[PDB]
C-alpha cells in the first residue's frame, strides 16, 4: 500500500547523445544542430503553451567530439542561455518578475518554474 503522491516525470539527455525520454524510452542520437529537448509549443493551438528547451552539442576546445552542451530555457517571454559553465538572461518580452528561480544544487544549475525544474551538470 503506497501513498498516492504524484511523482515528477523525468527526461534525461546526457553523454554523446543518449536520451531517456519522459515515458521511459531510451535511445541514442548524435546531433550537431539545435534540437528541441522539450516544448509546449506543439498543438492545435501552439500559443496556449508556455516553455521551450533547446540543446546542442558544444565542443569546448575544438570542433570535434562534443565536450559540453548549450541549453536555451525559454519561459513565455523570458529566455535563459546555459553555456560555458553558467547561465545568462536575454529577457526580451514583458519585464515582470522571473517565472523561474535559480539555484546551485551541488554540481548542478537548477532552474525551476514552479512545475518544471531543469538540472544541468554544467558540462
Amino acid at each position: 500500500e503506497c501513498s498516492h503522491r504524484l511523482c515528477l516525470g523525468t527526461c534525461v539527455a546526457y553523454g554523446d547523445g543518449h536520451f531517456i525520454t519522459f515515458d521511459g524510452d531510451r535511445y541514442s542520437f548524435e546531433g550537431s544542430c539545435e534540437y528541441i529537448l522539450a516544448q509546449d509549443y506543439c498543438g492545435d493551438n501552439t500559443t496556449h503553451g508556455t516553455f521551450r528547451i533547446v540543446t546542442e552539442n558544444i565542443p569546448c576546445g575544438t570542433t570535434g567530439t562534443t565536450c559540453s552542451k548549450a541549453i536555451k530555457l525559454f519561459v513565455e517571454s523570458y529566455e535563459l542561455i546555459l553555456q560555458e559553465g553558467t547561465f545568462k538572461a536575454v529577457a526580451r518580452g514583458p519585464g515582470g518578475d522571473p517565472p523561474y528561480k535559480i539555484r546551485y544544487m551541488g554540481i548542478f544549475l537548477v532552474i525551476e518554474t514552479h512545475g518544471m525544474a531543469v538540472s544541468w551538470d554544467r558540462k
Binding site: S32, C33, T46, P59, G61, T63
Partner: protein
C-alpha cells in the same frame, strides 16, 4: 542586440571596427582582419586578402583559423581543414552554409562570419572576446576613437594602421598602398543624402551615425556608378545589427534585386523563414532583421520539394525520405 560586437569590410576598401570607427584602407595583401591575440591560448584567427577584379575591389580569400579548424574561402569554394566540402557543412559547434546571398560560417560561441562572395564581409564576435582581440576590426574595448590608433602613444593614419596589421606569405613580399590623392565628385546629385537621410533608415539615424557612410557613398560615386549601393547595403546591415528596423530602399533603379516567383526581396525580413516542415520556426526566434528572399505572410516555404513558398495546406509531407 549585436550592438558593438560587429566589424565589417565593404565596397572600396571600407573597414568598420567593433566600436564604430570607419576608414578606407586600399591594401592589397593578406591582413589580420581579426585575431584573439591578448590571451594565453588563441581562439580565432580570421584573415582577409583583398584584390582586384578588373578594377572592382573584392575579397579574394578568407582564412579563418579557430580551435584547430582551418577554413579557407576563395574562388567560390570552401576548404575545410584542407579538403573541399559541399555546402552546407556542419559539425559540433561549426556550420558553414550558402544561406541567402552569402557564405556564412558560424562557430558557435566563437564567431559569425558572413562573406557576400565578392566585396562584403562581416564578423560577429562573442562578448567574452572584449579587449583580447587585435586586427583591423579593432580591440573590442568599446571605445572607438581613442585606442585603435595609438601605437606606443603615437596616433596613426588609416594607411599606417592597416599596414601594421599586415602578414606576408612565406615567399611573398607585397608592397603597401601609396596614399590616394585628393578626391572629387562628392554628392552632387544628392543621392547619398536623399537615400540615407530618407524615410527608410529613419530609426537607423537613432542608432548608427551616417556621416562616414555618407562620405563612403560619395567616394564610391567617385568610382564606378553601378557600385554606389554597397554603402547603403552596409548601412542596412549595421542598422539591422544595432537593433533598428531598416525599411525597403531598393527601387528598380537603385541597384534592383530579384528573387524567385513566390519569393520577394526584402530588407529586414525575419531570419527564420517559416517552412511547413517546421511551419512555426518563426515563433520565438531571436535574431534581428536580415535581408534576402522571403515569402508573403501566410504561405510558408516549401523546403521538401522546393516549389517556392506554398500555402500551409498544400505542401507535401515526408516519411522515411518519401515525399507525399
Amino acid at each position: 542586440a549585436h550592438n558593438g560586437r560587429v566589424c565589417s569590410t565593404w565596397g572600396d576598401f571600407h573597414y568598420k571596427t567593433f566600436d564604430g570607427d570607419v576608414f578606407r584602407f586600399p591594401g592589397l595583401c593578406n591582413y589580420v582582419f581579426s585575431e584573439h591575440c591578448r590571451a594565453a591560448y588563441e581562439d580565432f584567427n580570421v584573415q582577409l586578402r583583398r584584390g582586384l577584379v578588373g578594377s572592382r575591389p573584392v575579397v579574394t580569400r578568407v582564412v579563418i583559423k579557430a580551435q584547430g579548424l582551418v577554413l579557407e574561402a576563395s574562388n567560390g569554394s570552401v576548404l575545410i581543414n584542407g579538403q573541399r566540402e559541399e555546402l552546407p557543412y556542419s559539425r559540433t559547434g561549426l556550420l558553414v552554409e550558402q544561406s541567402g546571398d552569402y557564405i556564412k560560417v558560424s562557430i558557435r560561441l566563437v564567431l559569425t562570419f558572413l562573406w557576400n562572395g565578392e566585396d562584403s564581409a562581416l564578423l560577429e564576435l562573442d562578448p567574452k572576446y572584449a579587449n583580447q582581440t587585435c586586427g583591423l576590426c579593432g580591440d573590442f574595448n568599446g571605445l572607438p576613437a581613442f585606442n585603435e590608433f595609438y601605437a606606443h602613444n603615437a596616433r596613426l593614419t588609416p594607411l599606417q594602421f592597416g599596414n601594421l596589421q599586415k602578414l606576408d606569405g612565406p615567399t611573398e613580399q607585397c608592397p603597401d598602398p601609396l596614399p590616394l590623392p585628393a578626391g572629387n565628385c562628392t554628392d552632387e546629385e544628392g543621392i547619398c543624402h536623399r537615400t540615407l537621410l530618407g524615410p527608410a533608415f529613419a530609426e537607423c539615424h537613432a542608432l548608427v551615425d551616417s556621416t562616414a557612410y555618407l562620405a563612403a557613398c560619395a567616394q564610391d560615386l567617385c568610382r564606378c556608378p553601378t557600385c554606389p549601393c554597397a554603402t547603403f547595403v552596409e548601412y542596412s546591415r549595421q542598422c539591422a545589427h544595432a537593433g533598428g528596423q531598416p525599411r525597403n530602399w531598393r527601387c528598380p533603379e537603385l541597384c534592383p534585386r530579384t528573387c524567385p516567383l513566390n519569393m520577394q526581396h526584402q530588407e529586414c525580413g525575419s531570419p527564420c523563414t517559416d517552412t511547413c516542415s517546421n511551419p512555426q520556426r518563426a515563433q520565438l526566434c531571436e535574431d534581428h532583421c536580415v535581408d534576402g528572399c522571403f515569402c508573403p505572410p501566410g504561405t510558408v516555404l516549401d523546403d521538401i520539394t522546393h516549389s517556392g513558398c506554398l500555402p500551409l495546406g498544400q505542401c507535401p509531407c515526408t516519411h522515411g525520405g518519401r515525399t507525399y
